[PDB]
What we know:
This protein is mainly α. Helix content is 19%, strand content 4%. It starts with 15 loop residues before the first helix and ends in a 16-residue tail after the last helix. Belongs to the TRAFAC class translation factor GTPase superfamily. Classic translation factor GTPase family. TetM/TetO subfamily.
Amino acid sequence: MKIINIGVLAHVDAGKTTLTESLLYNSGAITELGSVDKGTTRTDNTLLERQRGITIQTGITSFQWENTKVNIIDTPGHMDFLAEVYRSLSVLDGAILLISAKDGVQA
RNA sequence: GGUUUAGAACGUCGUGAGACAGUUCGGUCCCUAUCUGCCGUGGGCGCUGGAGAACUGAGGGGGGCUGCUCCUAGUACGAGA
């Protein structure tokens, strides 16, 4: 009926939220811009976030694929005030870490 | 415009005339370029018989500044920024 929640643990500036945006593009449209390099929509919401080059807080965005709901949130992996991302864990059961190509997963 | 002419005034100094890089207001800045120099532009002659072209190029001059944006690449670097 509903759809399982999905996380986005982009540790060490993984950029996983951009992957959430591209996933938002793949789940489209039928009427969407398809996003763009940098910010860029991708549910950036508040000003000073996309302008800052990184989200100041975790967002949310409705999505659908394979005939089912697919909520997802990103990124909160920056810094630094990551406790809100820990709050995000209560907000969803799923997860999807974005592993770096640099010496494996970021510390 | 300032400083330095003659007028006037204030502060100060002096018995006073006056004085004060103390201040204030007002106040005629000439020259037709011979030579050198430089910018141009010619005439005379030479270059060896005269003439018309066309280059060669010794040499000399001019020009030479840099922003930003994007890409490379958000890559190297960095725990992140």
